[PDB]
């Protein structure tokens, strides 16, 4: 069971996420490439990127909507796809599918954004992040140049990602970290807390062992990761607050049904 639990979770991760750290790092390496990612660094390049990567946003009057609204829409589409992948990944985590459906819903509801921000680190560097399935790269400075409140969304995530990337984790490490995030026994409204705590204990057990053999020169890596879990929960609570503000003040930023479900009565 535990001897190869890490390998299985890792397989589920490689099978369910179209983008991971090894793939992202190759694209960001700057090495010779036949299809380098299109850089979005200003309004001009944003329109060019939309024309090729999401053509629908350059026609039908949509090109007349604020850049911020178009970017926010793309952010939503991206989150919906990631939530969809995380749901399939969760179903592949040993024991998750055995939980009562309500508990499965609750774990994903509170855990998906912690996992999303942790995984964002994989496609980010200090200057920006990969988007559109690795075909685009939007700069950190461009996002900062947007008008509030849209320019206030990404900075905290970039800051988190820089400190997270400093841990030099690889996909095998990340797959276990994400599983631990999802199988969290203290989420509000859980029914079988005991059952979930048992799953988490096993995952944390294999994670601790994995870090010991995969990262021998950093004896504090495990506690560092525990702190990251706490940092992520805070990052999500603050993000939800901003999302609620955008919902109440932005006329063309209505949330996609799935995202609305997730944030409804979250924090």
């Amino acid at each position: 069971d535990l001897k190869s639990l890490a390998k299985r979770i890792y397989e589920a991760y490689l099978k369910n996420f179209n983008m991971n750290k090894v793939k992202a790092r190759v694209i960001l390496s700057g090495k010779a490439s036949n299809n380098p990612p299109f850089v979005i660094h200003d309004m001009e390049t944003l329109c060019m990127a939309e024309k090729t990567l999401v053509a629908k946003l350059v026609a039908n009057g949509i090109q007349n909507k604020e850049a911020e609204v178009r970017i926010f829409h793309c952010c939503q589409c991206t989150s919906v796809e990631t939530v969809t992948e995380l749901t399939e990944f969760a179903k592949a985590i040993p024991g998750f599918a055995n939980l009562d459906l309500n508990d499965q819903v609750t774990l994903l509801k509170y855990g998906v954004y912690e996992a999303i921000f942790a995984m964002l680190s994989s496609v980010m560097n200090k200057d920006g992040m990969l988007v559109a399935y690795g075909n685009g790269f939007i700069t950190r400075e461009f996002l900062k140049s947007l008008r509030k409140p849209f320019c206030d969304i990404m900075e905290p995530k970039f800051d988190f990602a820089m400190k997270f990337n400093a841990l030099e984790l690889d996909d095998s490490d990340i797959s276990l970290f994400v599983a631990a995030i999802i199988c969290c026994g203290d989420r509000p409204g859980l029914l079988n807390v005991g059952h979930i705590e048992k799953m988490q204990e096993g995952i944390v057990h294999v994670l601790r062992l994995h870090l010991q053999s995969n990262h021998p020169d950093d004896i504090f890596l495990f506690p560092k990761l525990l702190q990251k879990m706490a940092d992520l929960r805070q990052l999500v609570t603050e993000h939800a607050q901003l999302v609620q503000i955008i919902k109440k003040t932005e006329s063309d930023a209505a949330l996609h049904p799935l995202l609305q479900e997730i944030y409804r009565d979250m924090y």
Binding site: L101, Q104, V105, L258, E261
Partner: peptide, 12 residues
């Protein structure tokens, strides 16, 4: 219903 989409995704 509450969480209609998540419930659906989980049951497939």
């Amino acid at each position: 219903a509450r969480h209609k989409i998540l419930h659906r995704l989980l049951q497939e």
